[PDB]
């Protein structure tokens, strides 16, 4: 498929071998976070790695991960390799989410710093470069969907920043639940059409007042019959269904911090405390790297 776990496993193995060689040549005592008394070492196999070792091991890869040529990986392919690692972990029974689990916060920070000042490359003769990261890549790796509270919250950001074209972090932050409205707007032309979509005003500062054109000033999502698992309307409806009743009807913030503890039959997944600015920026920095979103925003702003 789009995402290959073997590549991530190989990169992790190479880094682990190099780090083990460095540690053994330094021959400095260092104790692992495991219960048994043993010298700290990064397992050559991902699965056996402890919860803490993966975090520290993953954090350093952002600075020491090499390739056959020896050139440091570019940010996009590095993010792709981390996604491959996550796919490998999911395949072999590990349930940890390296991008959302609270125990993996530092890895997110280092990845955000690496991806902070990245820009698309026009280096190839073609004027548009296709990023390795793709929409189908994140979907396959269970980054996007209704699996966990954090992934769902990320999914809304993905579709919000694609359709509403809210590339900037401030555009997202200004968003609030009250401003977003859902209208069936059922068309009598098609019986039982059951059209549904959410509209949001765009922050276009113009001297003229009033609604010049309904479509020009607003962006509306659309149902996806190709897969019910991907319909932005369905996910948005499921998002509200799993949020506290108090927050609905509030005009302060749209995104809510996930609950650290959730169950499949839990009525509520989200707290009443909006996500922090740093977390918002960290999530955004990763979403822009996608190829589909990147080209969508490139076309929108240019036109």
């Amino acid at each position: 498929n789009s995402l290959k776990p073997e590549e991530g496993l190989e990169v992790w193995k190479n880094w682990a071998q190099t780090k083990n060689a460095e540690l053994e040549k330094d021959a400095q005592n260092r104790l692992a976070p495991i219960g048994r008394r043993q010298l700290l070492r990064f397992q050559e196999d991902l699965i056996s790695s402890a919860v803490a070792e993966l975090n520290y091991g993953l954090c350093l890869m952002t600075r020491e991960a090499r390739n056959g040529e020896g050139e440091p990986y570019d940010p996009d392919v590095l993010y792709y390799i981390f996604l491959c690692i996550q796919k490998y972990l999911f395949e072999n029974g590990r349930v940890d989410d390296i991008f959302s689990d609270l125990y993996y916060v530092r890895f997110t920070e280092w990845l955000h710093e690496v991806l902070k000042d990245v820009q698309p490359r026009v280096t190839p003769l073609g004027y548009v470069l296709p990023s390795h990261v793709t929409e189908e890549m994140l979907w396959e790796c269970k980054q996007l969907g209704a699996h966990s509270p954090s992934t769902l919250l990320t999914t809304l950001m993905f579709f919000n920043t694609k359709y509403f074209l809210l590339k900037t972090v401030d555009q997202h932050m200004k968003l609030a639940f009250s401003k977003v409205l859902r209208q069936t707007k059922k068309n009598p032309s098609n019986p039982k059409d059951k059209s549904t979509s959410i509209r949001y005003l765009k922050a276009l500062g113009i001297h003229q007042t009033g609604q010049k054109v309904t479509d020009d000033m607003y962006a509306e999502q659309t149902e996806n019959p190709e897969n019910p698992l991907r319909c932005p309307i369905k996910l948005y409806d499921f998002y509200l269904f799993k949020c506290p009743q108090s927050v609905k009807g509030r005009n302060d913030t749209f995104y809510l911090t996930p609950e650290p503890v959730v169950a499949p039959n839990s009525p509520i997944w989200y707290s009443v405390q909006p996500i922090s600015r740093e977390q918002m920026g960290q999530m955004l920095t990763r979403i822009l790297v996608i190829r589909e979103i990147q080209e969508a925003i490139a076309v929108a702003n240019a036109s």
Partner: protein, 379 residues
């Protein structure tokens, strides 16, 4: 046996005067006669410095777990965590079957404080009293073992292995262990301001147990002959014995269901002592305040009559096989009690909201004049 209303010594061909609690020497302060000293000793047992390891260059998860209860130990292989606990309780009830069940429930309660619904294996420590006639030991220990095993069966685990030793006082206890994935349990350090505290079992079990011993001694009985009669004391004894023998498996299940942040078991010390212990673990600056105190019927008055012996009001009274002290948001807690009270899965059991999580201090306290909720005698 469970079906029989009570353990009658004559039926088993033992002397009528025989009392299981006779071997132990009950004290007003319970098994925890020193509170600060035993607390410091327990902290010293868990005291460890090399585990900081430069904090592992970040917010490393604590191998100590809660620090004071149900330590979680990461494993080399599988990315799993070992979660095991241990607790020992001397006999305090006259029915050996029920007392063994109580010991098993007390041992398992610590796991349920971290939302570990299912247990892997359980060990048993069976102390044998020196001052016990050989004939008696052959009629009581089988009952205690059977109760322990039945409780283990009710908890989805089997008691295999253990140890048997001789001690002046009968010692009952064990070790409950579970090898579980990270998402299976709840680390109690996520409490935030605005939350509420939920208690799954009423307080005042120690008073009810102790008073039943005074029902025979005319010297001690006269000190409370006015405040509390005898039939209500017997009812409170029956209810405390039945309450101490339940299991918090449903509590753990609803804990996972309803977005719980932190929890702890009210076993030994007291509700206030355990609340103070819990507050220290919180990452944030949150201080607990306890407004209510569910106490068995006609037990607060006995505490007042007995003076400093018990001290229910101050929350320092020891408890055995006590309930959980969860920390849920308001709406989840409101739904929590409704579901546990009348669940379709099993039998109904009440739960009360007793406090509010205040911000700033990382300390626990009880308002100067707490309200007493006299738990109805199962009517």
């Amino acid at each position: 046996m469970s079906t029989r209303e009570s353990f009658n010594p004559e039926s088993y061909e033992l002397d009528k005067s025989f009392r299981l609690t006779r071997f132990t020497e009950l004290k007003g302060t319970g098994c925890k006669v020193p509170q600060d000293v035993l607390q410091k000793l327990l902290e010293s047992l868990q005291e460890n410095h090399f585990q900081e390891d430069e904090q592992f260059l970040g917010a490393v998860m604590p191998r100590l777990g809660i620090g004071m209860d149900t330590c979680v130990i990461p494993l080399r292989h599988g990315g799993l965590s070992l979660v095991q606990t241990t607790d020992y309780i001397y006999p305090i009830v006259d029915d050996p079957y029920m007392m063994g069940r109580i010991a098993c429930a007390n041992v398992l309660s610590d796991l349920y404080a971290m939302g570990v619904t299912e247990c892997d294996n359980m060990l048993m420590l069976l102390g044998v009293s020196n001052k016990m006639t050989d004939r008696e030991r052959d009629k009581v220990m089988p009952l205690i073992i059977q109760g322990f095993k039945d409780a283990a069966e009710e908890a989805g685990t089997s008691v295999t292995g253990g140890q048997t030793v001789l001690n002046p006082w009968i010692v009952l206890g064990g070790v409950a262990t579970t090898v579980c994935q990270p998402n299976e349990f709840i680390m109690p350090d996520n409490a935030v301001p605005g939350d509420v505290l939920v208690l799954t079992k009423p307080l005042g079990t120690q008073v009810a147990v102790a008073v039943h011993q005074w029902l025979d001694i005319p010297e001690k009985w006269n000190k409370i002959k006015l405040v509390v009669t005898q039939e209500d004391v017997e009812l409170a004894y029956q209810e405390a014995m039945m309450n101490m023998a339940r299991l918090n498996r449903t509590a753990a299940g609803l804990m996972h269901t309803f977005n719980a942040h932190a929890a702890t078991d009210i076993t030994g010390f007291g509700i206030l002592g355990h609340a103070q212990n819990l507050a220290k673990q919180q990452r944030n600056e949150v201080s607990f305040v306890i407004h209510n105190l569910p106490v068995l019927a006609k037990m607060a008055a006995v505490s007042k009559a007995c003076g400093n012996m018990f001290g229910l009001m101050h929350g320092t009274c020891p408890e055995t096989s006590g309930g959980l002290l969860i920390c849920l948001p308001r709406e989840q807690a409101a739904r929590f009690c409704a579901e546990i009270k009348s669940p379709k899965y099993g039998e109904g059991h009440q739960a009360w909201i007793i406090g509010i999580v205040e911000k700033g201090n990382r300390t626990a306290r009880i308002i100067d004049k707490p309200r007493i909720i006299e738990v109805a005698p199962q009517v």
